[PDB]
């Protein structure tokens, strides 16, 4: 109060000093709406995988490809994502991820990359130089290779030109490298493009099969196809379905509508919000703040003071003021001498008394305080209007004064205030 009053000695009277603002305790990130989908098993766990010459294009959408499911899918694989680390990609949600899947060899791993060349890079599947997305490359020796000799699986050895970005081609025409036409019969200058994969149990690791799944997203005008907690009556920072803000998530009683989510009120504030995961209505109230004022009976008389957090139901957050919860400090008054809930906040450091006296320091709602000894201390009596008096009114009783009193009373009225005159050019401009 001395700082706000900017004086070393304050007089009797309640002074407004600062504002008590209860800080939020926890943060709730509840935006789940339960909801989960997208299988990955169709593109990852399938026992039979399409060849490189017949690579699939299955864009997963309208569900979430939780990468933690696929982060650990096999002993070892190359999660060669492009443009973003796979871990950072987890929460990085993408509009239309075109998930492509196929199989390659071991020595051809270096040949399967954007801009690569060869009978399987230029001639089976070409990635753009500006390719955005990921490549998932694991081995499937026990699945895509046969111990009896897997010639059923084929890798194309000849094709004409490089594919366009993300383009497909499965041409199986008998290619001609000379002048003699094929005429529909295999022979001179007639080569089949598909060469059967060399997949033997005794074949080297360079000839060992390796599946390759290319999940690629195009950042377009689509929903990112691809994280929660709980709470109680305590005040927190709510994040209900991306509704930023802090408040008291008290239980609600209103009835929402099957489609309404973000309840509101007359003001812009979100008065209520339906709880996503439980499909229940939650009531949002602002954190119980309020100004704090100090009741003091005048430095001269005493340094003892009592404070009043205006507009708070303190029988809660300011009576359960934990270690340094109350703004004016001195946490020794967490309970204080006496806490008296009032219609105008509540008093800390003043003890209520049944006896009613004349108002000395007004507080509000008919409650006043004074430094009256009972042993000088601050009391919080209820203001007394005056000494109740009854006049003996009767049908034939009259009271007539026998004396009088020439009482002289003083009345003070201001008449004029100090005359002033300014000058902008002198004032505004130096």
């Amino acid at each position: 109060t001395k700082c706000t009053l900017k004086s070393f000695t304050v007089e009797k009277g309640i002074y407004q000093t600062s504002n008590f603002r209860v800080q939020p305790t926890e943060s709730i990130v509840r935006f789940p709406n339960i909801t989960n989908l997208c299988p990955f098993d169709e593109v990852f766990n399938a026992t039979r995988f399409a060849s490189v010459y017949a690579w699939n294009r299955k864009r997963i959408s309208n569900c979430v490809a939780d990468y933690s499911v696929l982060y650990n899918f096999a002993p070892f694989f190359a999660f060669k994502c492009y443009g973003v680390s796979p871990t950072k990609l987890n929460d990085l949600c993408f509009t239309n991820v075109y998930a492509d899947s196929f199989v390659i060899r071991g020595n051809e791993v270096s040949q399967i990359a954007p801009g690569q060349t060869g009978n399987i890079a230029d001639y089976n599947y070409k990635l753009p130089d500006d390719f955005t997305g990921c490549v998932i490359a694991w081995n499937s020796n026990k699945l895509d290779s046969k111990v009896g000799g897997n010639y059923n699986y084929r890798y194309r050895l000849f094709r004409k030109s490089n594919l366009k970005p993300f383009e497909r081609d499965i041409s199986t025409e008998i290619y001609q490298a000379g002048n003699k036409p094929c005429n529909g019969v295999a022979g001179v200058n007639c080569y089949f493009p598909l060469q059967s994969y060399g997949f033997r149990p005794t074949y080297g690791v360079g000839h060992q099969p390796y599946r390759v799944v290319v999940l690629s997203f195009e950042l377009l005008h689509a929903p990112a196809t691809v994280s929660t907690n709980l709470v109680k009556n305590k005040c927190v920072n709510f994040n209900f379905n991306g509704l930023t803000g802090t408040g008291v998530l008290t239980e609600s009683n209103k009835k929402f509508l099957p489609f309404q989510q973000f309840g509101r009120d007359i003001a812009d504030t979100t008065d209520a919000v339906r709880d996503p995961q439980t499909l229940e209505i939650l009531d949002i109230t602002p954190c119980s703040f309020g100004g704090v004022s100090v009741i003091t009976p005048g430095t001269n008389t005493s340094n003892q003071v009592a404070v009043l957090y205006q507009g708070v139901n303190c029988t809660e957050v300011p009576v359960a003021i934990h270690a340094d919860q109350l703004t004016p400090t001195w946490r020794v008054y967490s309970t204080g001498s006496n806490v008296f809930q009032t219609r105008a906040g509540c008093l800390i450091g003043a003890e209520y008394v049944n006896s009613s006296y004349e108002c000395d320091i007004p507080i509000g709602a008919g409650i006043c305080a004074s430094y009256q000894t009972q042993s000088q201390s601050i009391i919080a009596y209820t203001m007394s209007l005056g000494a109740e008096n009854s006049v003996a009114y009767s049908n034939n009783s009259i009271a007539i004064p026998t004396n009088f009193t020439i009482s002289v009373t003083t009345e003070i009225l201001p008449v004029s205030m100090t005359k002033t005159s300014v000058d902008c050019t002198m004032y505004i401009c130096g």
Partner: nanobody
Amino acid sequence: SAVQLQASGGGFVQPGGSLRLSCAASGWAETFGHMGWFRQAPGKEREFVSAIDWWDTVHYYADSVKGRFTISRDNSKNTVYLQMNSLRAEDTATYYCAYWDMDYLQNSIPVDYWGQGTQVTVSS
């Protein structure tokens, strides 16, 4: 690149003895890099011993291990081996499993993973 490297092997050998160590990758990889070996003797630096391409086609052998040490990879258990022969007095070194997270052995320095110590002593 959460490349889980597991180390195994070790012991005591004779001058001209032999050994076989196993290291492997798992979890998930940034890309198929280079599998190699290193020795960081007590107080010494990690020294290039031998690097091998993942597909057992591009092999490397250091001058000190030319004709003495050998490197090979298994084709059915995802393990890559190491041999050592004809050790001298100064070959007592600590060995950590090595890993190159790059497609080409540009230099002996660029690495992204390492192993744990392994004391090697030569005696009869």
